[PDB]
Structure 1
């Protein structure tokens, strides 16, 4: 049915090859010139985003590169009772932690360190002349350094802090993937470190910006690349799952819609994370490979719409890793945009999503 729509979404093999070539050439040199005893000496590369998760659509012009810092012995103080934003404190005084120059009092400067980070990058992108490079202005709020290579190929770089300590109290009931995947897998997955990225946008007065956001992008990559209740789902032609195909078309649905409303109107200001988080809860309640048969492509899609419709209809989508945190909270999005969104899809669903062609 809609199986042909995927052909209009497959990335050209030569496009990804040339794009990732120039992206890697800038990233490695930027990473090489980084880590010169600015306490960045142990920065590592973490590949996340819709590309490395094999769900990138249209043309490969955007990348999500993450830089990590293995900063040890960090004590985190929960900001208010948000359950997601955190103060970075330090557990003990003696060791002289590498980011101590970025310590304000007992809290870490999410602004001074991030500006220093952009400073080192802006200094060295000019020096290299192998590739035309323009640094996009830091977008109001945006914690990322958006580089623009010649002729698109934008690169989003988010400085992150790696924490090998155990996860937090907020994530205690999250990641409810026990019938799906394994309870053994959850333990194996929880031991992996959690990451800290500066808060993306203004909230509250706009000050006290030293809050940090939890990030489990590496977690989302692992379970996507090993997604089957049986270990060999997608290993062989038999029992190929449609999981990736569902939120692929879902991302194309919303991507298609945002472009459609180019009037600077509503249905704006929410990204694929809501689609990905919704598809995540879909696979939770559907923890069997039989439910995700390839033949029932329109059925599993319809079930994923149904849960997204219901997530819209219920006006609550909690973060997968953080249950209390609601991505469809009344503060985040007005109920009218859900009315806006549900109006479209229901029309598009019965009338076979006419925006595809």
Structure 2
């Protein structure tokens, strides 16, 4: 089965500015560290749409020392940030205003790019560098406290990456990105992009997974192909609105759930790529049909609930993906 799949991954590697990204990113951080409010800003981890090699994605982190999170209305993912506080200008009463902080952030960046690069209208900010390279800059608060209680039952990697690794990972900070909920516009959602990267690049039960020939697995390739399938289908139907609400994050979440379900490295041997990918697709399909895709870190938050994505969009994606899988994925070509 895997012949066309391996061809796809070969072209995908072939395709992959970063320097041009690093220049302006470090310049922006240089100026942002001059402000009293963004003094502790810094790069969180360049990152990527697998099919868009010129679309970059960076995250600026800013530690907020001693914070009081207040969960917003039983939504397990959205919070208010309550608290010499260098964010004094951004408070609106007792909660921190994402709108004000973001407006400042964008203003500093807009003034700093006009010295060199266009900033698009409201990912907090999107810069377009010379009609070819684009960079989405996201601002996130960093908290070095223990994780919120809604993550208590998430990150169930104990049988895969081990309970020891889970404890070490949960000792790391967590992040908060502004996102309006429903739309309450001063709420923040949790971010674990650092943990996701760690999980994906250190992904085997064996510490030497993918480091020698006897232990080559196909986890990363399965995730690559899943993201590519979704990106290609989103392009093919961009003029309708069906696939608009689907993102690489849904596919990455489903992939992590599959990793939990298949924790042994031998279930991911490279020679079985064909079936492994099939299984991955199938699991994603199941998540679509049952309208259930729990956040990997907050299991009570369903990314596929009918309040976030309607049934018609899910059924459309299901029909498209089933056609592709029945026809040796013509969309890849």
**TM-score, reference length from structure 1:** 0.89
Pick which of 276-285 and 36-45 moved more.
36-45
CA–CA separation in structure 2 for the residues paired with 1:310 and 1:270 = 15
* CA deviations over 1:65-88 (Å, ceiling 9, x no partner): 111111101000000101111000
- The verdict on how the C-alpha distance between 1:265 and 1:59 changes in structure 2, with shifts beyond 3 A counting, is closer
In the alignment, which residue of structure 1 is the partner of 2:121? 137
CA–CA separation in structure 1 for the residues paired with 2:67 and 2:159 = 33
The answer to whether the 8 A contact 1:42-1:70 is kept is yes
CA–CA separation in structure 2 for the residues paired with 1:112 and 1:343 = 43
CA–CA separation in structure 2 for the residues paired with 1:183 and 1:78 = 27
Secondary structure of the structure 1 residue equivalent to 2:30: helix
Pick which of 292-301 and 99-108 moved more.
99-108
1:53 shift after superposition: 6.7
- The verdict on how the C-alpha distance between 1:153 and 1:198 changes in structure 2, with shifts beyond 3 A counting, is same
1:137 shift after superposition: 1.3
The answer to whether the 8 A contact 1:278-1:317 is kept is yes
The answer to whether the 8 A contact 2:174-2:191 is kept is yes
- The verdict on how the C-alpha distance between 1:200 and 1:248 changes in structure 2, with shifts beyond 3 A counting, is farther
1:238 shift after superposition: 2.0
Secondary structure of the structure 2 residue equivalent to 1:147: strand
1:11 shift after superposition: 4.3
* CA deviations over 1:210-233 (Å, ceiling 9, x no partner): 111100011101111100111110
Secondary structure of the structure 2 residue equivalent to 1:26: helix
* CA deviations over 1:45-99 (Å, ceiling 9, x no partner): 113xxxx678x63352111111111110100000010111100001xxxxx2211
The answer to whether the 8 A contact 1:44-1:69 is kept is yes
CA–CA separation in structure 1 for the residues paired with 2:314 and 2:226 = 16
RMSD: 1.6
1:172 shift after superposition: 0.5
More helix by share: 2
* CA deviations over 1:228-278 (Å, ceiling 9, x no partner): 111110111222110010111111111111111132331222111110001
* CA deviations over 1:289-348 (Å, ceiling 9, x no partner): 000000001111011112112111221001000111000001011112221111121221
Secondary structure of the structure 2 residue equivalent to 1:158: strand
* CA deviations over 1:97-141 (Å, ceiling 9, x no partner): 21122111110011111100100000010012xxxx111111xxx
The answer to whether the 8 A contact 1:53-1:225 is kept is no
Gaps of 5+ in 2: none
CA–CA separation in structure 1 for the residues paired with 2:121 and 2:128 = 10
The answer to whether the 8 A contact 1:11-1:58 is kept is no
CA–CA separation in structure 2 for the residues paired with 1:11 and 1:144 = 30
CA–CA separation in structure 1 for the residues paired with 2:161 and 2:22 = 33
In the alignment, which residue of structure 1 is the partner of 2:39? 41
The answer to whether the 8 A contact 2:47-2:58 is kept is no
1:201 shift after superposition: 6.9
Gaps of 5+ in 1: 14-18, 91-95
Secondary structure of the structure 2 residue equivalent to 1:154: strand
Pick which of 150-159 and 179-188 moved more.
150-159
In the alignment, which residue of structure 1 is the partner of 2:146? 166
Alignment: residue pair count: 330
CA–CA separation in structure 2 for the residues paired with 1:113 and 1:240 = 46
CA–CA separation in structure 2 for the residues paired with 1:122 and 1:213 = 25
CA–CA separation in structure 2 for the residues paired with 1:68 and 1:297 = 37
**TM-score, reference length from structure 2:** 0.95
CA–CA separation in structure 2 for the residues paired with 1:11 and 1:60 = 10
CA–CA separation in structure 1 for the residues paired with 2:8 and 2:272 = 16
